[PDB]
DNA sequence: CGGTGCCGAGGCCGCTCAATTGGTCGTAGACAGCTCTAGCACCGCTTAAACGCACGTACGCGCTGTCCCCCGCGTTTTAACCGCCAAGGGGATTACTCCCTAGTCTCCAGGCACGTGTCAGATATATACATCCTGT
DNA sequence: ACAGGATGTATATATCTGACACGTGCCTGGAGACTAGGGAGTAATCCCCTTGGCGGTTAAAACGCGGGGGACAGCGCGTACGTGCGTTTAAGCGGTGCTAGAGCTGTCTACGACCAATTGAGCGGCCTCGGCACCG
């Protein structure tokens, strides 16, 4: 169990259930593991760069909102 | 500790204007606050860009009106520019 | 019983609610592991990792809905990795 | 002591919007007092539209408070605001 | 003194033209019902871009649409285009 | 003598891919641009460079759409594109109708 | 008696970049002296990468003059430059790309 | 008639630096000019946004460096920040 | 459809700092006037491309086994969740001070339209070779 | 399974002309010199929110078994798009001319920036109570 493997099969299954997927194959688990890893990597690079600019060592919520705001995937509900 | 600027009171006031009895959760209030800040930021940025395009330096009502005719889609923009002209006329035709 | 009914039950149930689907602690461990590379010994506000979880869940939901459209295009009812890769290619993230 | 916001017959703090627009400009950027009331009216109309849709959805669900789920429902329900707001509502949900 | 209220110019994008476009696009074979729908999508794309450019040039108080304004309109739609004005 | 059906298509693929020049007749496209410009505001004139740039962006967007629909159809185990492929690709990208 | 570009050993106008950055900086904002130098260096390196790629592309076609087709080929050839320039090249065309089931 | 600002001469100079014999068409020169203006506009906008985030008012080299670490992807950004530090050190370590 | 509990949210103070009105100025735009570059409208000529159509042949769509494989349940087993306690790193202030950058004056030189004289690349043409299409 | 054999493509040369790199005269925005003030760098101090850990506790993961279902080769056929042919049109070019709106330029004025004395509304606490979140 690597640290990526926390995103397990029933979690991704329920996620696809929210999207309306009726039936899932086998390799989708590995596929979405890789995809979500890529996406979180892309966000967290920007968040760490913001925080390192601000001379802080704590990734606050405001910088996560900023990083999502820059990447065309803005998110409300946290101020900014 | 220093107070932070918000918009919550004005959202509450306009809500009570349109709906006299209903309420709004605090989390939804924060959502609306962020949404107001986002829309106003987009309008201000677009107006600044337009003023820099036309080689002018004073953002009057005209560039703001063009910004809402730009960002918002059709009939929403029409209602918006109507309310904008109505408000600015009520402002100007006063003391 | 029969296969094909509990699925639709899950569709209804997990679209009625709005609570978090990915469980919090393994996701937070994943976030800490990923941030371990781009800098050393970070710290995270709980609100920040909550926001990251919310955004990632919304993104995965959107991707699954789109790849479901892609799969139902090919007359199947089961998605496949080529469908997800096709959806991400069409959006253009190419990652 | 006439409170210019009421001189426009509006709720939004037109002085605060004025000093907000005062900063996000070009090098020697100036804003016109006629523009602040216009942006205030734009924000007031947009908030009124979103909040009345959310309140209609709330009275559909028979709840005095407006939850973010109501905001998600109202935004994705009417096509116009969804076409304007491409954002992701925190804790909102799907359709 | 304007004349010539235009009509039927949506048929200007003729069938061999769209054929040539898709040939550049990397399409091998084309079913005959494509032409109407690609005429439609071309119509709506030009509608949005021309609308934004017209709003620009009307803001500058001009009776004609310069190229720089079309480039600006394409910039605001995420499809910015180099070569002409910026 | 006659070619095999499809070989001429691949010849034209190579030809119209390695070329660069524009692909829609200039005057009909300009007439169409003015026709769409009519209802938004009357008595409009156009710089020739402006219509040129509109043609460039138009052909670019259509080429991207056609390539993406070809990706969709080749995923769909066919060779001929179809209007539902175009509608699917636009629905994925973010546009709608 | 020296210019700031040669003072830093660059090739982009430090004064012009400084005036532009002063012209787009949140009216009551100020612009540091070194920041213009940094921005000029950044733009210089980006142009260096794109122009070197264009030259390497044109050299394989035996043309001493760089054309927009060469710009588009050089940009879409590399991956990360393609990730940067998301725009459209006027008259650049597309890259020769043929898929699997097209035979 | 009033002259217009451009970048063509500097593009020609850096081209002759990297490639001593080749040439560039005028249309390609205009393309590169527009591309330079676009990249510089993106960097300036991002630096202004970052300075407004951190409640500061003087865009030094730090916010610019963060802007290029933001916009450009990985190894290109690494080469860029290396050349930036090298140039600013050559500037500072002078008369 | 009522019961009980919960604290989230709505209404009520103290206060302090941001609107606000009054007075000045000066600079930015409004506007009238004048030019003239460039866009619109014919006219004619050529001709390449659109267009109609006649076959036919690749192939899109549908139907049929069919075997992998994916969903549903059942049991265990495991690691998340809640609650609570502890230490302290770092976030968030205030308070100096001085480094740095906004200005102004003077100056001139790198930079920008303008011309022009050379030539690099488009175009054409005539060779020297790939390359599909039946086929013994 | 290469043998003809039209049918398209390297390739070298010839031309040719518009494009462009380089040389000018000119000329405002960059540089250098100085001064002022104020933004932030650093320094210190407080406190809080973050990490760490423990212990129960219990819903969710997780193998595993089984049974139906659907993904998919494989045929098979029956519309339809490619590949031509001849035929017609309007795209393009080149001119030719007409005029009007883009672009400067010079005045004039007006409105917004700036400064200050004032005061009230917007926010931090804070109380409190009833709208909702569950439960026969």
Author numbering:
A (entry chain B): 23 to 102
B (entry chain H): 1428 to 1522
C (entry chain A): 441 to 535
D (entry chain G): 1016 to 1110
E (entry chain F): 217 to 302
F (entry chain E): 639 to 735
G (entry chain C): 816 to 918
H (entry chain D): 1228 to 1322
What did the authors write?
Variant H2A.Z, a subtype of canonical histone H2A, is broadly distributed in eukaryotes and is essential for the survival of Drosophila, Tetrahymena and mouse (1–3). Best known for its role in facilitating transcription initiation, variant H2A.Z is found to predominantly accumulate upstream and downstream of the nucleosome-free region (NFR) of active genes or transcriptionally poised genes. Here we report cryo-electron microscopy (cryo-EM) structures of nucleosomes and chromatin fibers containing H2A.Z and those containing canonical H2A.
3D classification of the H2A.Z nucleosome dataset shows all classes with shorter and variable DNA ends, contrary to the canonical nucleosome dataset showing well-ordered DNA ends in the most dominant class. The final H2A.Z nucleosome density map was calculated from two best classes without imposing symmetry. It shows a well-defined DNA-end on one side and missing DNA density on the other side, indicating the mobility of the DNA terminus. To better interpret the cryo-EM map, we generated an atomic model of the H2A.Z-NCP, showing that the H2A.Z-containing histone octamer only compacts ∼136 bp of DNA. In contrary, the end-DNA on disc face 2 (DF2) of the H2A.Z nucleosome is well-ordered. The histone core of the H2A.Z nucleosome is similar to the crystal structures of both the canonical nucleosome and the H2A.Z nucleosome, except at regions that come into close contact with the last turn of DNA on DF1. Noticeably, part of the docking domain (residues 111 – 127 of the C-terminal loop) and the last five amino acids (residue 40-HRYRP-44) at the end of the H3 N-terminal tail is missing at DF1 but not at DF2. Histone H3 αN helix that connects the docking domain with the exit DNA are present in both faces.
